[PDB]
Amino acid sequence: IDAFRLINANMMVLGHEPRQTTSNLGHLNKPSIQALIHGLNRHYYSITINYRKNELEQKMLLNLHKKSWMEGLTLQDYSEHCKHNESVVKEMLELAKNYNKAVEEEDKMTPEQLAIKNVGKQDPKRHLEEHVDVLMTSNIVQCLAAMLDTVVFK
Amino acid sequence: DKKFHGILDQGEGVLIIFDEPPVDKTYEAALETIQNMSKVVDSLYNKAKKLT
Amino acid sequence: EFILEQMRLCLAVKDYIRTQIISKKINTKFFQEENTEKLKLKYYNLMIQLDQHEGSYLSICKHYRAIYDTPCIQAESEKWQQALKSVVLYVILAPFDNEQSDLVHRISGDKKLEEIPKYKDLLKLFTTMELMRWSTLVEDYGMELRKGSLESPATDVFGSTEEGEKRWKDLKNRVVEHNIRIMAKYYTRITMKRMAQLLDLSVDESEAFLSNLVVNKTIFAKVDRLAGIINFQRPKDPNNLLNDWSQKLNSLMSLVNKTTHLIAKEEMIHNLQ
Amino acid sequence: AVQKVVVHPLVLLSVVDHFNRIGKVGNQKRVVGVLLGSWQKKVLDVSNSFAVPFDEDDKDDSVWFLDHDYLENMYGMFKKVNARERIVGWYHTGPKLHKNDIAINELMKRYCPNSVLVIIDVKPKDLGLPTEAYISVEEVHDDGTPTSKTFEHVTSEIGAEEAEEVGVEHLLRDIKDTTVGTLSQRITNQVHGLKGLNSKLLDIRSYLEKVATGKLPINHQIIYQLQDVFNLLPDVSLQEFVKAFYLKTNDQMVVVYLASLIRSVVALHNLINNKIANRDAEKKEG
Amino acid sequence: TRPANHRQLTFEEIAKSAKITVNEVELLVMKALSVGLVKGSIDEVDKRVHMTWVQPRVLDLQQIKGMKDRLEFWCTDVKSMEMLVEHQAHDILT
């Protein structure tokens, strides 16, 4: 929101440096090179800003943006939770075979070479610990949410 | 020959007929991962045990 | 008009295999009826003989409504009374279908079809609950298909005795079958004597009736022949117990969601100001 | 006919700033304004609004005023600056459903066919969403009369927009409970949603305030639904509800055991990757 | 009248309280399901029916005391189970 305002080209012809800095508040942000290509400091000047906040709006946006209504008190497709759980584990097996593949070129050429070299084909490591987290948070939430309703509902 | 399955009674010839595949896809697919990872830990000797 | 002739010559030979071809030339050749009140109807009178015979009790649907369509027939009411006869004797004869189950609403809602007092009740039979077997049915409607001015396609039922046999049978599915439908709907488990008493025939013939529908798998049932304990719609369901339980959870939370905003306005129409 | 509504933070603040600029009246003023927006695919949208001048006296509380010149000129300007934007309904500041809002909607139904209202909050506190929208419905019944134009709350939510998320999320910079692991579910619905069921539990308890002391309508249409609630109490822990539960928990904890099994091996392999970084650095550097 | 403990009645009881014979009560209850005032299932061999959903009726100021009491401990069920969540799940998110 870099707001500006004109500086006098008359005073530019005078060669007189304007705006008489009396406070360490102006030269804090650094200007963009594209504005330096444009007028910037030959025709106008920069202005620092801030934002006026209160308490009253901050809460009524914070509590009013993304509030799930009763969603976690559901069961999430009770046939297909475990079926999707299969649908990750099945290729997680062969990705674990890649984890039985990628360990076996250690004690080899200088693992920065193992950093430049793994740029064409996927690693089992990061891809593995992805799916472990996905199955974990996929299962535990449905597990507990399945069990609150047995107490709360009779 | 397992093309049909059930039972055959000998006293009076009764064929209780029943069928369901309970769970097949799950425990074996989670199982062969374990025997992959055991081989991985066997490979971890050859970068860990001999090394340091 | 020339090309619609020779299909009667093929039907003089009883050539279905050519009759459907040369009629398939002209099934796309519609929209000439607008100056021929009868010649379009002559195309249809050869379409029964292709369709009445073998099994095509659903191909005579658009036939019979199509010969109800023609606006000349409406002013020859008694020859149009047998068009009311034609518009009922094939919607029922037709085997069970979604096309039947809305076709009954196509023919239903008619101001002038219920002028026959019998056949509004005849369509009332198949929509509603259990049908009076057959013998108590033919006591009420086996004679009205002989008496009256509407008697002539009911003589197409009766008179030709083999078409007769097909329609005594062309009802034999329907009712003998209708009961089986709501038995599968409402009966969890029944013996192999109560059902056969509700069919008024043998337990052996009852097993022949329950065989060809489950090898058709249009009714799923697991019968018994030692204690006769037969049942309907019995899987094991490791899933739908807790699944439909969760459905009751969702409907429950929606239900308590319903009353909550309903109460507040009711307080506001008494205790606002 | 209307499925649900979509409310923006721009209109949401755009009631509040007007409430501040009338905030010097002090005594009593509802902030009635014209709600603008569209609806597509039977999904109601609200994007812009303004506020009509409005005064109302307590004695003979049926005397309301909308400056339709202020309606037509400013809506003509808003159509001119945006022909895509149009009317969608109205709103009022809505503490507790004021009485003239039975015929405000009838006063300006000639603009929008589903002239919707929106009740907002100016003192923001709840354990839910302080955003409301009814709909005008009239249904003669067998326990009243003809004119039965009551209001029915269509469900509501705060919709987002790619334009406004950038500036809004800039306008927070304060606190943001991201890093969704399990904690976001555990707190936004396993902590919060149970207390959501607390208030809906408590509301019929507030209605139950009529046993011998409350208002005059006794039952009629309140008890079929509650009768369906206590009819709709779920199955007890005896029949087969136990067996499939131990079945599927007995399947879920398998997969949990697999993931927890592999995770330690991952961290072990990383510890090997760290001791190679230790032992071939202490001698090399010195 | 029958509680959610069972709400499962028999054709002997129907033949007792309606004094109508054994070979008519099935047509009666199938007619009731066809109308749809009641929703349930029919077993023939054990002569019982699992009636589930009933047509809702009206009631006086006395049954709201019973619905009040069934509301009452249902409140503290939600309180009691939720207190485990607030107490145990406290250290996850302050």
From Swiss-Prot, chain A:
Widely expressed. Highest levels in heart and skeletal muscle. Transmembrane segments: none annotated. The modification Phosphothreonine is found at residue 110. The modification Phosphoserine is found at residue 68. Component of the 26S proteasome, a multiprotein complex involved in the ATP-dependent degradation of ubiquitinated proteins. This complex plays a key role in the maintenance of protein homeostasis by removing misfolded or damaged proteins, which could impair cellular functions, and by removing proteins whose functions are no longer required. Therefore, the proteasome participates in numerous cellular processes, including cell cycle progression, apoptosis, or DNA damage repair. Component of the 19S proteasome regulatory particle complex. The 26S proteasome consists of a 20S core particle (CP) and two 19S regulatory subunits (RP). The regulatory particle is made of a lid composed of 9 subunits including PSMD4, a base containing 6 ATPases and few additional components. Within the complex, PSMD4 interacts with subunit PSMD7 through their respective MPN domain. Interacts with TXNL1. Belongs to the peptidase M67A family. PSMD14 subfamily. This is 26S proteasome non-ATPase regulatory subunit 14. It comes from Homo sapiens (Human). The lineage of its organism: Eukaryota, Metazoa, Chordata, Craniata, Vertebrata. The gene is PSMD14.
From Swiss-Prot, chain C:
GO terms for biological process: proteasome-mediated ubiquitin-dependent protein catabolic process. One of its GO terms (cellular component) is cytoplasm. Disulfide bonds: none annotated. Residues 59-237 form the PCI domain. The modification N6-acetyllysine is found at residues 38, 185. Keywords: Acetylation, Intellectual disability, Isopeptide bond, Proteasome, Ubl conjugation. Component of the 19S proteasome regulatory particle complex. The 26S proteasome consists of a 20S core particle (CP) and two 19S regulatory subunits (RP). The regulatory particle is made of a lid composed of 9 subunits including PSMD12, a base containing 6 ATPases and few additional components. Interacts with ERCC6. It is linked to Stankiewicz-Isidor syndrome: A neurodevelopmental disorder characterized by delayed psychomotor development, intellectual disability, behavioral disorders, mild dysmorphism, ophthalmologic anomalies, feeding difficulties, deafness, and variable congenital malformations of the cardiac and/or urogenital systems. Belongs to the proteasome subunit p55 family. This is 26S proteasome non-ATPase regulatory subunit 12. The lineage of its organism: Eukaryota, Metazoa, Chordata, Craniata, Vertebrata. The chain holds residues 184 to 456 of 456 of the full protein.
Swiss-Prot record, chain D:
The keyword Ubl conjugation applies. Pfam families: JAB (PF01398), MitMem_reg (PF13012). One of its GO terms (molecular function) is protein homodimerization activity. GO terms for biological process: proteasome-mediated ubiquitin-dependent protein catabolic process. Residues 5-140 form the MPN domain. Keywords: Acetylation, Isopeptide bond, Proteasome, Ubl conjugation. GO terms for cellular component: cytosol; extracellular exosome; extracellular region; ficolin-1-rich granule lumen; membrane; nucleoplasm; nucleus; proteasome complex. Component of the 19S proteasome regulatory particle complex. The 26S proteasome consists of a 20S core particle (CP) and two 19S regulatory subunits (RP). The regulatory particle is made of a lid composed of 9 subunits including PSMD7, a base containing 6 ATPases and few additional components. Within the complex, PSMD7 interacts with subunit PSMD4 through their respective MPN domain. Interacts with TRIM5. It comes from the Eukaryota. Coiled coil: none annotated. Belongs to the peptidase M67A family. This is 26S proteasome non-ATPase regulatory subunit 7. The modification N6-acetyllysine is found at residues 200, 210. The lineage of its organism: Eukaryota, Metazoa, Chordata, Craniata, Vertebrata. There is a cross-link at residue 176 (Glycyl lysine isopeptide (Lys-Gly) (interchain with G-Cter in ubiquitin)). InterPro entries: EIF3F/CSN6-like_C, JAMM/MPN+_dom, MPN, MPN_RPN7_8. Does not bind a metal ion.
Swiss-Prot record, chain E:
The modification N6-acetyllysine is found at residue 16. Coiled coil: none annotated. Component of the 26S proteasome, a multiprotein complex involved in the ATP-dependent degradation of ubiquitinated proteins. This complex plays a key role in the maintenance of protein homeostasis by removing misfolded or damaged proteins, which could impair cellular functions, and by removing proteins whose functions are no longer required. Therefore, the proteasome participates in numerous cellular processes, including cell cycle progression, apoptosis, or DNA damage repair. Component of the 19S proteasome regulatory particle complex. The 26S proteasome consists of a 20S core particle (CP) and two 19S regulatory subunits (RP). The regulatory particle is made of a lid composed of 9 subunits including PSMD13, a base containing 6 ATPases and few additional components. Belongs to the proteasome subunit S11 family. This is 26S proteasome non-ATPase regulatory subunit 13.
